[PDB]
Amino acid sequence: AKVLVLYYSMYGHIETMARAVAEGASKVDGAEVVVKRVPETMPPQLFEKAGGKTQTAPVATPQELADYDAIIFGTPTRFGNMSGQMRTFLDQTGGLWASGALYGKLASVFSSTGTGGGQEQTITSTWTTLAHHGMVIVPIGYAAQELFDVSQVRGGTPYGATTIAGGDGSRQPSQEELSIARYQGEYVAGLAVKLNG
Template sequence: MSNVKILVLYYSMFGHVETLARTAAEAINAVDGAEAVLKRVPEHIPDDVLQSFGAKTSQTAPVADPGELAEYDGFLFGTPTRFGNMAGQMRNFFDQTGTLWAEGKLVGKPAGVFVSTGTGSGNETTVLSMVPTLVHHGMVFVGLPYSAPELTDISEVRGGSCYGAGTIAAGDGSRQPSEKELNLMRFQAKHLTDVARKLKG
């Protein structure tokens, strides 16, 4: 089977998406012949402003450069919701990929999305707000199939949908991703890796 290199690229203000991203990378690295690279998009809000409302500023993942996307066989993009859309930091990153689009560097590569929402509202629309960009690049959107057991489990509040894994973050940041949400992230990461391997092979 083909070896694949998957980029897990995220933006996280309070650490919820970062936790999902690290979980995804671990799941990918556990697949034989697969390598995950964990990176984040640049922050545009000054540190003092971030610190004033308790944002997590100590994230250790390196910052990605838009041009490097061409190096990967597949992608998982993570973002919190901003009024039902991807965060501006993620949008700005994609807005710098025009050269990749013009040269068709991402055509045929699989991409999935995972999210964090404060109330659950935006859980699906945030993923869908990213799909047009992925499709314009010619990427193959990969969701989260219902063969993931937790996706049909409604015994407790959780994020995630058939569009992608997710977590629900309480307004004060006290709720962290649950084990069921993390399992959905693991499932999506492994599924995306399998699709990437098939497309590459």
């Protein structure tokens, strides 16, 4: 099976999580894992001025989504929605939609916020789009044990992995957060192999 980890990141938090997801997915022997990013939509000079992080990942086209058996979407929260960059990208998949190109493919979502609020809503509002495409939606439930831990501040929900970046973005993803992100990649990649070989 081919698994795409398709993300948007301004400051690197989602990018770090995406690498944890790909690393989890890679544990699955029949799974070929690819990590790509959506295009930046901001002017490059404003991106740079805002202290945006440069990223090595190749840039995806909307069309190449059809080449995968499973897509794990990563996006920071913008007021409890996916980011304008991710939304802009998915608004270009009308050709794919009209030809049934993602129908029955697997979809899963991870997210990042500054102080936690909106992390659930970002994921489940992304599911809505995946559903219009007839994609099978993969939540993580409570198989990741770190989800039971209330002793430290941490991202992660039954809908998908998440990280808390802090108000100023100074937090890095915790071990527990990355561990849930690895689980998500393992689980979705296992389902992709199970369905598609």
